[PDB]
Every structure is written in C-alpha cells, then in structure tokens.
C-alpha cells in the first residue's frame, strides 16, 4: 500500500499549500508605510573582559542582570561581575571540548555539555567552601548542541542525534522525548510563559512543540540551508531564524506564513547568532566576517554597525532590563556595548 | 574603596594569577588527531562512546592522541574544534581491496579543507605482510584496474603511494608516508622523527629565512 500512502501524503501537502495562499490579504511591507524611521544608531565599547586563552563558544546573563557566565576550549568556566569587572568563580572542567552552557533563573545552578554526549550540573552556594558537581545526565547518542534550564528540577536538551528530550534533575532520568526532525538539531528557544519551545535543524526547517503534551503542532519551511540561530519575539507570537546563506526570516504563529526577509547585496556569509531588543523594535545578528549588524524590525533596513572583533562573532546576548549588549568571539575577549 | 570591596578585589587577583600558571603548563604538549577507516588496525598504531583520548611519553616529550569513533554525525559541524593540531595521523588497510575507493575519497575530503590548509599529514599503511601473501593468486587489477605494474609485491605498493601523492593539490603541505609490518613494529620512533620536521618548518617561517 506504499503508492496509496505516498499520494495520501501528497494530496494533503497540496491542500496546506492552498490554505496559506488564501489567507494573505496583503504583505506587511504595504502596512508598515506611514511611520517615522528609527534613525542612525551608534554605541561605543563600555567594558572589556580578559582571562580566557582559547576560542569563546557560549555565554549567558542572569535574571539579576549583573553577573554572567562564559565557556572556552582551555577547559575553564568563569563567572564575571560586569560592573567592577572582577572574577567571582573559576571552575576547572573535566573534558576540554564544550559547546554550550546555561545559567538558572534562581541563580543557584549552572549547566554545560560538549562532545562527550554528557550534560553536567554544578551546585553553587555549597555549605563547604568549594564548588562541586551536583548530578550528571548521560542518555544521548550524539554531541550536545543547546540546553536551557526550565526550572531548578527541569532542563531541555537537544543533540546531533536528530532528537531532543526533557530531564528530571532530582531522579536523573528522561521524562519525555521529541522525535519529529530528520537532521542535526542546532538551537532551541523557550517561550516567555515556559509552555512552548521551537527548534531549528540541518534539514532547513523549524518545528513548534508542546512541553506538557509531547507533540509538534506546526512546521515552517522557508530556507535553503542549515538553520544556526533562533530567538522568540518579546510578545511571544513570532520568532526569527538565522541561517548559513546570509538571510534572516520573521514568522508568525496565529497566521502560518513567513512575514519578512532581511538581506543586503554586500554580505555573502552565514549568521551565527540572533537576538531582539526589550521593546522588540531592533534585531541584532552576528555574522562570521568580523561584523555585527543592527536591522530595523519593521522597515527591514540597516540602522547601524557595531565595531569589529579580531576574529568571528560566535555568541551575543541582550540583558533583561535591556541596558547593555554583550558579545564573545574566537580572539578570546568579551566586549559590553551601550 | 570599601572594607569588603577591597577583600573581593584581593580574591580576584589570586584567581587571575592561578589560571595563567596552567596556561604555561599546557603549552608543552603535542596534540595529534587520529582519523581513518574502521578495522584498519587503528589500536596497534596508537601504541555511546563520545570520544577516546589517550596519552604516552617517549624520550622526554608528552603526546596526546584524540580518536573520534561512534559519532556518526556531520563532521564539518564539529571539525571546527580541532582547527589547530600539530599534525594528522590517517590509517589505511591493504588487506581488503572493497574499502579502498571509500578510504581514498575520505582522504581526498580531509586533505583539501578550508581549516586544514598548512596542517601536514602522517600516512600509515598497515597489514604489510598480509597484503604481500594474497598478491600471489588474486591479481592487483581488481582495484585501481587501469594499471598495476609487476605481478609480485615489491613494486605494487609503489602504485598506491603514487595515488595518495596525486590526490594532494596543496602548494605548501607535506605527507610523511611510512609502512607498518603486521602487529610487531615500533612506531613511536617513526612519529618522533615526523613531529621534528614540522616544528623546524614552523620556526623557519617565524625567522627571517624563507
């Protein structure tokens, strides 16, 4: 019955292609006329952090929005105080090759996973002096891409095994596994209400899951390469995807179409990181040509350029209250902007 | 400029000084990436598994070998991490000729890469005596069918070594190809020699010479 099942799959793909076409009354580019432009933006480097002796791969702010984390290839994990610019904790890592790291919202825990297919939780604020490893969770088959603390006993983890799963830190066992994708999963992003999350992989597609249920609802396909970065809109009814063909896209959830594309004829290289502003009127994007652009989020034109690092921009983060932006790179220095 | 804020600053300078001592200590090591096909006598050569990392010492110098097996993902995605490595060690088995074309294209893939422009290679051909036993009856025209040479061993191996040099199209990249005999051959000496030239070659670029 393979020929019968193959057409039953086709006829439904033809229906969904005609559903999305009959909804679009007009484009956004028509409605976004008759508004005042943002006008040229400019920021200087406020502070510089030094200590790492290898490429910076990941970093993360805290809810306090004064302390931040970072990880490098030398096998160290440093916690900085951004105001006085002094080190609080420097942890010696077990295996040298780390790719991602997180920071809990309570500010009591830290995670990091690499090419060992293992995620390690570190307990800050021990009764004795030193920091130690609370728990170790190894259930994956491939390397870890991303991980995010849902709560102090719940964490979400994606891998190069073409799957992602939800963990319980106290018992140290998998709760539920999500299976839809056909390529290596690169990034994921939590919703504001910690109910929904979306991921993006190397089959040039992105899916939207339901944490409590364990099923995919929608699939958005608009790229021509491997999706690297992804980020939710502050309102929580849209997101933006960064790809390896020098283009960013803007999708909606209530309306199923793609609403905008961002591209310049000069740039010809892939995006590493994306992030929104607090109001969500600016959209920052890290490229691998030693340059970070600042796009308008409605007009879809460049509003400014942040001064280059010596090597590729790997990770950038906007803080909660929205005062500063922080960026890392392969020349092993962090810089904070304003 | 406070009671506690001064003590907090004193702690930071103690941490700052501590990790730079480890930075100097970790610069006296030789890092080697051990690639190649599976069942190619990789284990003898060294003398959900994520990564196997080994270490030995020979003539007062510390070596570190990183073997990547049982990963089965997209290489390019995670070959960024191994961008600077003193050298690469590739292994091939002459025992069976139907894994030669797969191993040859695989070598051609790693050889000409964006990140490995100037990184030199060491090429170990194994099961030397086993290859030379079965050259008697089974002709060499089964693989690399266009030409072989003489029927017997001595001038056959020359033809394979020639194919791997033909695959190199890089302007300034060396290939130190040696031959291993069965499972009883000293290889530590062979590597120690190959590592020396690579350090000498790097220092010449640093000097006014060349």
């Amino acid at each position, epitope marked *: 019955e393979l020929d019968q099942l193959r057409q039953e799959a086709e006829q439904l793909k033809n229906q969904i292609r005609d559903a999305r076409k009959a909804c679009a009354d007009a484009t956004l580019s028509q409605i976004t006329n008759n508004i005042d432009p943002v006008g040229r933006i400019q920021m200087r480097t406020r502070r510089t952090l030094r200590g790492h002796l290898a490429k910076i791969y990941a970093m993360h702010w805290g809810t306090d929005s004064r302390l931040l984390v970072s990880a490098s290839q030398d096998g160290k994990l440093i916690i900085w105080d951004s105001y006085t610019t002094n080190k*609080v904790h420097a942890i010696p890592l077990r295996s040298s090759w780390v790719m991602t790291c997180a920071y809990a919202p309570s500010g009591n825990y830290v995670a990091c996973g690499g090419l060992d297919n293992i995620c390690s939780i570190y307990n800050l604020k021990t009764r004795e*002096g*030193n920091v130690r490893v609370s728990r170790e969770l190894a259930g994956h088959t491939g390397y870890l891409s991303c991980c995010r603390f849902l709560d102090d006993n719940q964490i979400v983890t994606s891998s190069g095994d073409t799957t992602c799963a939800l963990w319980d830190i106290e018992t140290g066992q998998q709760t539920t596994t999500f299976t839809g994708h056909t390529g290596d999963v690169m990034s994921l992003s939590l919703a504001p209400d910690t109910r929904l999350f979306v991921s993006g992989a190397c089959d040039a597609s992105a899916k939207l899951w339901d944490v409590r249920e364990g099923m995919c609802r929608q699939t958005f396909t608009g790229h021509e390469s491997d999706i690297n970065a992804i980020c939710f809109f502050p309102n929580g009814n849209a997101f933006a995807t960064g790809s390896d063909d020098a283009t960013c896209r803007l999708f909606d959830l209530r309306a199923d179409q793609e609403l905008m594309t961002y591209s310049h004829d000069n740039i010809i290289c892939g995006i590493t990181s994306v992030s929104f502003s607090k109001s969500g009127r600016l959209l920052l994007a890290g490229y691998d040509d030693f340059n970070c652009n600042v796009w308008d989020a409605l007009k879809a034109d460049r509003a400014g350029v942040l001064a280059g690092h010596d090597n590729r921009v790997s990770c950038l983060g906007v803080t909660d209250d929205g005062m500063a932006v922080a960026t890392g790179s392969w020349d092993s220095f962090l810089k904070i902007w304003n | 400029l406070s009671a506690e804020e001064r*003590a*907090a600053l*004193e702690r930071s300078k*103690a941490i700052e000084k501590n990790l730079k001592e480890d930075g100097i200590s970790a610069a006296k090591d030789v890092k080697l990436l051990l690639l190649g096909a599976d069942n190619s006598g990789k284990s003898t050569i060294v003398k959900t598994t994520g990564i196997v990392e080994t270490h030995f010492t020979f003539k007062n110098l510390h070596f570190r070998l990183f073997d990547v097996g049982g990963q089965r993902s997209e290489r390019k995605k995670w070959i960024h991490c191994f961008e600077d490595v003193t050298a690469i060690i590739f292994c091939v088995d002459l025992s069976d000729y139907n894994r030669m074309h797969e191993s040859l294209m695989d070598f051609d893939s790693i050889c000409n890469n964006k990140f490995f422009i100037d990184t030199s290679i060491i090429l170990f051909l194994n099961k030397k005596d086993l290859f030379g036993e079965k050259i008697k009856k089974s002709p060499l025209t089964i693989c690399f069918p266009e030409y072989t040479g003489p029927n017997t061993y001595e001038d056959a191996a020359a033809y394979i070594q020639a194919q791997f040099e033909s695959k190199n199209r890089s302007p300034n990249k060396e290939i130190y190809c040696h031959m291993t005999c069965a499972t009883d051959t000293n290889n530590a000496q062979v590597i120690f020699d190959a590592v020396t030239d690579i350090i000498i070659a790097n220092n010449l670029r640093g000097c006014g010479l060349y």
Partner: single-chain antibody
Framework: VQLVESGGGLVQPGGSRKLSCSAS????????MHWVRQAPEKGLEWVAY????????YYADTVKGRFTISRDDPKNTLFLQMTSLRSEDTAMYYC??????????????WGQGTTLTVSSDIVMTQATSSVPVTPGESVSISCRSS???????????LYWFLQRPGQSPQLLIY???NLASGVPDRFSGSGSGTAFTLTISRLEAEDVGVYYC?????????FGAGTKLEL
C-alpha cells in the same frame, strides 16, 4: 563543618602562651579567619584578623605589637601567639571563619572557645539592659549608630547576632536586610541612615538570648553593649 580550639589554662602575670584552632569538614585554604574575646561580665570585642593566602594582617588598637597571628595551610591549623600578658586579658577566645566575594555571608560559623585566666572609631549604643517579654507577642530591638553606615552603593553594613545561655553566638541577619540560611522566617530587619530596628513576630520558647549589634564599614569592627530578653 567543625572548628575546635585548645591550649590555655591559668598562667603567671607577664608570661607567654600559644592558642591553636584546628579546622575540619571544609576548604580551609579559601576562607579568612578572625579572633574574638569575651570578658567574664561584659560584651564581645574584636582582637585580630588574617586574610586567605596570608596577604593582609590587621590587629586591634589595645593589643598592637604584643600579640601575633599565623596560619598553616598544609595541616589546616590557626595559631595565636601572645607574650607579656597583663591582668585584663582574662576571657574566653572564639575562632571565627569568613569569606568575601559578591553576595556572600561573613561570620556565618563560630568555634566553641577556650577559657584562659591570669591570676592577680565608630561608636554604637543599644539603649536597653533587660526587656520584659511574654510568649505570643511581637517585640522591637533598637541599635543607634554614631555616623551613617550607608556607602555610595545602596548596601548598608550592619549585622545582628544572638547568644543563648551557655553556648556559642550565631548569625541572624547580614547586611541589614538579608537573612542567614537555616534561620526561621519570624525575624525581620529594617532601618535608614543612623537609626535601625530588629522586629520579632510571635516569639516562642528557646528564643531568648543576648542580641548583639555589629558594623563592618571600617577596621576595627566595634560591637554593641547587648540587649537581654527575660523569662
């Protein structure tokens, strides 16, 4: 965690003796260390301090040049060497640990203390001696300062300690507002400038002791006179 100290009995006036404090159950290398005295019918008072890595040393005004302090990291032991003892050093001696980085609690854990006998700045006032109390009632303790303990940064340096009858004193509140780990949710702290208040809600049995008031703005650390809660 366990800090135990020993050495010292009765001496001859103008002699010498050593005090040894031996630690176990934590990383001794990382923490700083203090010495604190308590006369037989009086409040607490500070003596000496050594930082982690032996980088900085400070003494009191009273005992400067007479006493000396030193630590041994390999064996985890703290030494206090005292020479030419006068006839007003007759007191218990406590052995206190502390740590300093952004968002931590100094003076969290105290020792047990040894009895030594000899045979023959910021001023802070607590206008109370004994306060009448009854169980199931709310009370207020008031510590008044000399000059304002608020810095350029928002944080105010004021600590509250409690001593039960025949035991070692423990930390209740650090940096005025914040509350110490393991302490119940009955105690609360408030104050602005030079006047401060400790408020207790629904006091119950095994909660009566001498309450002390300490500042950490400048060296040397001055303590209060102390407030007593009756039976």
């Amino acid at each position: 965690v366990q800090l135990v100290e020993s050495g010292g009995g009765l001496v001859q006036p103008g002699g010498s003796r050593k005090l040894s404090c031996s630690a176990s159950g934590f990383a001794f290398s990382s923490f700083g260390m203090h010495w604190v005295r308590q006369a037989p019918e009086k409040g607490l008072e500070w003596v000496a301090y050594i930082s982690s890595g032996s980088g900085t040393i400070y003494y009191a005004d009273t005992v400067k040049g007479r006493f000396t302090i030193s630590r041994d990291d390999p064996k985890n032991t703290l030494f206090l060497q005292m020479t030419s003892l006068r006839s007003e050093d007759t007191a218990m001696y406590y052995c206190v640990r502390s740590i300093y980085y952004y968002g931590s609690s100094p003076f969290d854990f105290w020792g047990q203390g040894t009895t030594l006998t000899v045979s023959s700045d910021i001023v802070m006032t607590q206008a109370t001696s004994s306060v009448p109390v009854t169980p199931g009632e709310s009370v207020s303790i008031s510590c008044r300062s000399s000059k304002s303990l608020l810095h350029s940064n928002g944080n105010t340096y004021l600590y509250w300690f409690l001593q039960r009858p025949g035991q070692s004193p423990q930390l209740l509140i650090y940096r005025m507002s914040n509350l110490a780990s393991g302490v119940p949710d009955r105690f609360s702290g408030s104050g602005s400038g030079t006047a401060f208040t400790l408020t207790i809600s629904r006091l119950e049995a095994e909660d009566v002791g001498v309450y002390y008031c300490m500042q950490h703005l400048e060296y040397p650390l001055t303590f209060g006179a102390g407030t007593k809660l009756e039976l």
